[model samples]
Target: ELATYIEEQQLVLLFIKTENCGVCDVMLRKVNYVLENYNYVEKIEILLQDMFTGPTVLLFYNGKEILRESRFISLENLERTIQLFE
Candidate 1:
């Protein structure tokens, strides 16, 4: 069901993160910052999943994955990648 919804959406950003992960918390906060800069107007969706073994980010556009990064997340690179779809 989650995959189906993400595939059908034009843009979807999913963060599968874990608790006690300071890095994950920081990374998610940064993502939230970038999110505030845009006007989705239903153009995008951000999903945060419960605790997990690792932190992962999935960026999908039109059913295709534009990028999937886990660990050592790059803020600048992520920003540039997101800008492409925006």
Candidate 2:
């Protein structure tokens, strides 16, 4: 499923978060809002167990990782980066 998205979608955003991350919900909400302006970008959320970390945001373009933000993400920076591709 994931591989298909990466290969097929022109742009992809992967949100990876651990099982017990309280901030994941908040961050995901904010990310979702940010993504609303970019309809072409595909969003995927995954929950992984046994990882002690905050949330991760990955942007893939043409099946390649163009940007990766982990732990502490700056929304302003994220939008700016996305604009570069847009």
Candidate 3:
């Protein structure tokens, strides 16, 4: 599955849930917005999760998902990841 590929590749990922939570819904919507306007899958990945948080996002490198994690994603944080490697 693509989800496995994400964890296996050390790629940055975005996770959102389907519940009616504000953060989850907002993140999911924003991710969709980015997807429609950008080429993220070509470079990174967008994932969905309903088991973790009601409304939240998480990102990490392939082998570093568990080692490195971020919650409560923001556009600034999204950009923040790129800066990490810079």
Candidate 4:
């Protein structure tokens, strides 16, 4: 049900992270930066689920899972990864 909703629409970031995780916090900030600073990301969906071992960021586009990252995911790498979908 949830996955289908993401597929039916545009690009979506389903982020799953723990409450007190430093890396997870970093992951959140990086993603936010991309969303705020990038014009290519004109319209997209972002959902933060506060529940995961580390920080898991799932990128969905056109009804398919494009990218998945868990751990210390860099901002530049994340940006590069997102650029592929754009």
3 or 4, greater by TM-score: 4
Q: What order do candidates take by lDDT, descending?
A: 2, 1, 4, 3
Clash totals, every prediction? 0, 0, 3, 0
RMSD of 1: 3.7
Query: What local lDDT does model 3 show for residue 58?
Result: 52
Q: Cα lDDT of model 3 overall?
A: 0.50
Q: RMSD for all candidates, in order, please.
A: 3.7, 2.1, 4.9, 3.7
* lDDT of candidate 3 over 11-77, digit per residue (tens): 4554545544566656666656654543433234334544654344455565454222334556555
TM-score of every model versus the real structure: 0.71, 0.85, 0.49, 0.67
Which residue pairs clash in candidate 3?
Answer: 10-61, 10-62, 24-55
What TM-score does candidate 4 reach?
Answer: 0.67
Top candidate on lDDT is: 2
lDDT value for model 4: 0.66
Question: In model 4, where do residues sit more than 4 Å from their true spots?
Answer: 39-52
* Residue 63 in model 1: lDDT: 69
- In order, candidate lDDTs are 0.66, 0.85, 0.50, 0.66
Which structure is stronger by lDDT: 1 or 2? 2
Worst 10 residues of 2 by lDDT: 1-10
**Model 4 per-residue lDDT tens digits across residues 1-86:** 66565445666666776666676666677778787855544334334545445677777676577777777666676678778766
lDDT of 3 at 43: 36
How much lDDT does candidate 2 score?
0.85
